[PDB]
Design an enzyme around this catalytic site. Structure first.
Site, PDB file in Angstrom:
ATOM      1  N   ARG A   8      90.955 -10.051  22.776  1.00  0.00           N
ATOM      2  CA  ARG A   8      90.034 -10.914  22.048  1.00  0.00           C
ATOM      3  C   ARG A   8      88.772 -10.126  21.672  1.00  0.00           C
ATOM      4  O   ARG A   8      88.846  -9.011  21.144  1.00  0.00           O
ATOM      5  CB  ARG A   8      89.901 -12.242  22.812  1.00  0.00           C
ATOM      6  CG  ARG A   8      91.192 -13.061  22.780  1.00  0.00           C
ATOM      7  CD  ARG A   8      91.189 -14.204  23.780  1.00  0.00           C
ATOM      8  NE  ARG A   8      90.067 -15.133  23.588  1.00  0.00           N
ATOM      9  CZ  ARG A   8      90.035 -16.162  22.740  1.00  0.00           C
ATOM     10  NH1 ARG A   8      91.075 -16.447  21.967  1.00  0.00           N
ATOM     11  NH2 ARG A   8      88.952 -16.924  22.684  1.00  0.00           N
ATOM     12  N   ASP A  29      75.726 -17.266  23.442  1.00  0.00           N
ATOM     13  CA  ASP A  29      76.423 -18.365  22.788  1.00  0.00           C
ATOM     14  C   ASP A  29      75.422 -19.059  21.866  1.00  0.00           C
ATOM     15  O   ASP A  29      74.380 -19.511  22.333  1.00  0.00           O
ATOM     16  CB  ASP A  29      77.041 -19.278  23.834  1.00  0.00           C
ATOM     17  CG  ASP A  29      77.869 -20.429  23.287  1.00  0.00           C
ATOM     18  OD1 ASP A  29      77.499 -20.955  22.227  1.00  0.00           O
ATOM     19  OD2 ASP A  29      78.837 -20.817  23.976  1.00  0.00           O
ATOM     20  N   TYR A  74      78.955 -23.839  32.471  1.00  0.00           N
ATOM     21  CA  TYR A  74      79.041 -22.800  31.457  1.00  0.00           C
ATOM     22  C   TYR A  74      77.694 -22.653  30.744  1.00  0.00           C
ATOM     23  O   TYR A  74      77.214 -21.539  30.541  1.00  0.00           O
ATOM     24  CB  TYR A  74      80.183 -23.167  30.496  1.00  0.00           C
ATOM     25  CG  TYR A  74      80.174 -22.237  29.290  1.00  0.00           C
ATOM     26  CD1 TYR A  74      80.718 -20.961  29.347  1.00  0.00           C
ATOM     27  CD2 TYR A  74      79.538 -22.621  28.113  1.00  0.00           C
ATOM     28  CE1 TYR A  74      80.684 -20.117  28.242  1.00  0.00           C
ATOM     29  CE2 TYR A  74      79.473 -21.779  27.012  1.00  0.00           C
ATOM     30  CZ  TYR A  74      80.033 -20.516  27.080  1.00  0.00           C
ATOM     31  OH  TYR A  74      79.958 -19.683  25.996  1.00  0.00           O
TER      32      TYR A  74
END
Ligand SMILES: NC(=O)C1=CN([C@@H]2O[C@H](COP(=O)(O)OP(=O)(O)OC[C@H]3O[C@@H](n4cnc5c(N)ncnc54)[C@H](OP(=O)(O)O)[C@@H]3O)[C@@H](O)[C@H]2O)C=CC1
Ligand SMILES: NC(=O)C1=CN([C@@H]2O[C@H](COP(=O)(O)OP(=O)(O)OC[C@H]3O[C@@H](n4cnc5c(N)ncnc54)[C@H](OP(=O)(O)O)[C@@H]3O)[C@@H](O)[C@H]2O)C=CC1
Ligand SMILES: NC(=O)C1=CN([C@@H]2O[C@H](COP(=O)(O)OP(=O)(O)OC[C@H]3O[C@@H](n4cnc5c(N)ncnc54)[C@H](OP(=O)(O)O)[C@@H]3O)[C@@H](O)[C@H]2O)C=CC1
Ligand SMILES: NC(=O)C1=CN([C@@H]2O[C@H](COP(=O)(O)OP(=O)(O)OC[C@H]3O[C@@H](n4cnc5c(N)ncnc54)[C@H](OP(=O)(O)O)[C@@H]3O)[C@@H](O)[C@H]2O)C=CC1
Ligand SMILES: N=C(N)Nc1nc2c(Cl)cc(Cl)cc2[nH]1
Ligand SMILES: N=C(N)Nc1nc2c(Cl)cc(Cl)cc2[nH]1
Ligand SMILES: N=C(N)Nc1nc2c(Cl)cc(Cl)cc2[nH]1
Ligand SMILES: N=C(N)Nc1nc2c(Cl)cc(Cl)cc2[nH]1
Lengths: 251, 249, 258, 250
Positions: free
Chosen positions: D13, D143, D156
């Site tokens: 990935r 993120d 998370y």
């Protein structure tokens, strides 16, 4: 004797709610308006009925122009003329409409209205307020919780509200030595536009995590009243989101 | 054919370095200027010597006024008149001076600081978009706008407005494939009027190397954002500040 | 819940790290507002018991104490459940959780082992708030809310405080994530972010003054009561639409450049 | 002689794309993995076929525990053991799954995995990298959506917010040593392996720029910029690579 407040765009909606809640807390109020003369006078009458000589109206256009500084100075002057002091300024008045980048008001008008009401008039009002004090003095700016996830085609409005965040921070820093606190309240969705249909209103309501409803005008006013109160005496440069979690919700 | 870029305030300092680096990467450039006519023309001369017919100048005042929309349309138009296309817009031009809350007329201060830093970028963005590949806009922001210099309210308002424009335009122009991003210097080239002692006080605050950014280093981030290596990036503001914004009072 | 909880009469709150300083001021203001309180503590046993005694002398059986180490470990979930449990045992309900307890000390990148540093700083500042939030939400059987004590300077951190800063940033994440997830249950989750408030009692006045002079609004640190005032607002009926918000109470400190 | 990089979670990935692009830029690489041994060795083989002796694998569990400091020290050690230097650290490995607040893994495990991989291991790797010390830098995979989180992803999100704090704190502290610390924040990039076509299209349709997810290579391009000579004054910055996703309201 009673402190005095200026609320811009105070004839209706959130500005009226702020004016009323300040008045109920013991403030004398200047109800600024632009076009809503009948509503402004109606509000002042109600407030004066509760306590005589505690409310006045003041008309001004807050569109950007070379005379906007004079208009802003005049609003502050009207508080001093009526009440002999000016303790609180709430910058509430705001134009809000789309200004698409790609293709009826001219673009010149669009800029003048959206940047004038949301940013430049608050700056000039802040200057005039400060210079008249050059006690619990503060300024509250009505911001917008969604300006980092903006509505499509609202560039000028969003620029204006971002500039208002910059003013809140810059003025907080600069006026702190004079004991003047400068803070913001950032609604998400509160009172929906008069023109909006109920179906479209419900679309917005269903997005809000906390209760799937818009904020009442009183809920916004509650945050303003906190910020002007003694319970916020160490708070300056802060923007309190009052948005029911709306700004936390992803696409 | 070579793509074309408009750089505002490109005669000197950071805007000059951006124009130069875009030119070196293969762009034809419009060097916008306000007062620095000699420097603008000298730059155009220098670039044209490297590659003929690849640089022009365009003069305009970016102060806010009722004629500013027309001026901004003409800046974009100058790129089409010269080069037949306009692929990149760099909003670099900027007025920067203190505007104390307790005091040029105030209306001039408003016009210059909000005009150059926010309104002209908006109008240029509108004109650029209305025409429209690797198209993008880069706005020169400011890494220190959440910890502002004392008495710079109008400047800070203009730069915050420019963040708002970057975000709103990124969203709205995404369907046309136009990316809109920002580069936020901390301290780069210090003001020409500033004494070296005062310059040094600023240099000493910067964690990474105790020095200001070169104009070249700011230009490097602009070049990245216009490049194919940034094809998925829109609405981003890249700080180029040596860690200055991380340092507490 | 044993008889005599008076659960119908008044709400109840848990305040972590409440024996002294800001946590004490929060517990006192909540109690003054009409809340029953759990005073959680770790090492300050005399101060915690003394405080609860004073509150009980004001209104009988309206304060209890609960000791727990909030260091991360495999027993921390059970410790956090027990703190929430202690509120239900004493008062029959738990309306407010204030995550105030916090370890704060440097952890340079270049006596405590690193694993202890991680366990204490990330445990107290982030993991324990998460576990307490879970226990608080699950135990719900109305103005429910959580207030997390954040830090206004986490984007301009003190040198060599990486683990502390990581913990406080995680706590922002928890405030936002929990606000979104608990909104359907009517539980609001907000933060209060002091700048400089009560400095170490032991810190030289001359060092305290270095910090005070940086503060635009009055060149002084916040009192513990000023911090508590913002907590009181957030738990009140005047904040019923506010969730996911962090109110800075910093006198402008975070606006001041290097 | 060639600089060397450690990429955590590099077998598949995004981490694989990062390791490849670093290698293509001339770096020798440590391919860290946890479970994906076959994929890690396959990648190392491909890179070594291109340039002999330029790629090694290193296995480690990055779950939080009292031995996590030792594991992280070992990963950095592996780079010095192989290549004699360590110029770049990319903190890419990440656990990602829901952890609801209201009701097979215990909450203890959930905390250890999510906070360990996303925050604590990056911190310990940063410490080991700094201690063991051209153009040195660390890139943290952040993120873009952490202020508009997915429902029931609290641990998370806590981890990724902590990672922002680390990026800032370590940039400030390591700047005097000439180590830059930055992040790259994807929005939606490679979608979860388990996700069906309909759901994948739902997410793609949210992205303003192209109505598609980022490729792994697009994410890698931003990492490459940050470690390059074109970013020598950049530290403490997080570059969003999200196609505008974070700008889209509910
Ligand atoms: N309603 C909401 O959901 C939200 C509101 N906000 C902010 O909260 C504040 C209050 O919102 P809301 O009550 O809906 O505001 P409105 O849209 O109702 O506007 C308030 C008043 O602004 C005045 N105004 C508009 N243009 C001008 C002008 N050129 N010169 C002078 N005054 C002018 C008008 O006064 P008059 O009628 O007398 O002409 C109007 O009544 C605003 O700052 C807004 O941006 C933020 C997010 C959401
Ligand atoms: N230098 C630094 O440390 C920092 C810079 N930045 C930003 O980076 C950008 C470049 O910085 P820097 O090179 O120092 O900028 P300058 O201050 O040198 O200004 C750039 C150019 O702006 C033009 N300009 C000014 N006023 C007007 C006007 N009214 N109309 C049209 N153009 C005008 C001038 O053109 P002319 O000379 O032709 O009259 C000037 O040369 C700016 O956006 C700035 O805010 C951000 C933070 C720090
Ligand atoms: N004071 C300030 O200037 C600032 C404070 N804040 C935040 O505000 C809050 C209150 O600050 P302040 O009053 O100064 O905090 P303190 O440093 O006084 O700590 C509060 C309490 O935390 C408890 N605590 C510490 N470690 C543990 C542990 N391992 N397990 C359980 N409890 C523990 C202690 O309990 P005991 O004594 O019983 O052991 C301590 O009394 C904190 O969250 C802090 O980060 C933020 C910015 C500035
Ligand atoms: N994909 C996306 O859309 C987005 C990704 N990101 C971030 O970008 C980075 C790369 O994303 P992506 O490629 O999807 O990541 P993956 O979810 O594919 O995870 C990458 C690797 O992390 C390793 N890992 C997981 N748990 C552990 C553990 N306990 N110990 C050690 N290694 C572990 C695994 O190694 P192994 O297989 O060898 O066990 C895995 O292959 C991550 O930090 C992610 O949070 C951010 C936003 C969106
Ligand atoms: N002056 C206004 N009416 N401003 C304003 N009104 C707004 C509404 Cl009804 C919704 C959102 Cl999301 C932002 C808004 N800003
Ligand atoms: N037009 C400009 N020169 N803008 C600008 N110049 C700046 C400098 Cl010399 C320092 C910081 Cl902190 C911000 C600055 N913004
Ligand atoms: N638990 C704590 N004491 N936290 C804490 N204490 C702090 C102090 Cl006395 C100053 C700053 Cl700037 C941050 C602080 N955070
Ligand atoms: N380790 C990971 N796979 N992390 C991760 N993966 C993510 C995906 Cl597929 C989407 C979003 Cl919005 C965030 C994500 N973070």
């Amino acid at each position: 004797e009673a402190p005095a407040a200026v609320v811009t765009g105070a004839a209706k909606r959130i500005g009226r709610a702020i004016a009323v809640k300040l008045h109920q807390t013991g403030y004398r109020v200047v109800i600024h308006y632009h076009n809503s003369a009948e509503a402004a006078v109606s509000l002042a009458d109600e407030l004066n009925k509760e306590r005589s000589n505690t409310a006045v109206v003041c008309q001004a256009d807050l569109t950007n122009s070379n005379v906007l500084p004079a208009s802003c100075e005049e609003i502050i002057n009207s508080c001093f003329r009526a009440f002999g002091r000016c303790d609180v300024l709430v910058n509430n008045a705001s134009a809000f409409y789309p200004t698409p980048l790609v293709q009826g008001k001219t673009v010149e008008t669009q800029v003048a209205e959206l940047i004038g009401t949301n940013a430049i008039a608050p700056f000039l009002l802040t200057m005039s307020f400060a210079q008249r004090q050059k006690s619990n003095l503060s300024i509250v700016n009505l911001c917008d919780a969604m300006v980092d996830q903006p509505c499509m085609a609202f560039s000028l409005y969003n620029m204006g509200k971002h500039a208002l965040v910059g003013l809140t921070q810059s003025a907080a820093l600069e006026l702190a030595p004079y004991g003047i606190r400068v803070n913001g309240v950032a609604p998400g969705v509160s009172l929906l536009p008069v023109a909006m249909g109920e179906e479209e209103k419900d679309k917005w309501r269903r997005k809000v995590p906390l209760g799937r409803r818009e904020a009442s005008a009183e809920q916004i006013a509650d945050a303003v009243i906190f910020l002007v109160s003694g319970s916020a005496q160490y708070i300056t440069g802060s923007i309190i989101k009052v948005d029911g979690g709306l700004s936390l919700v992803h696409a």
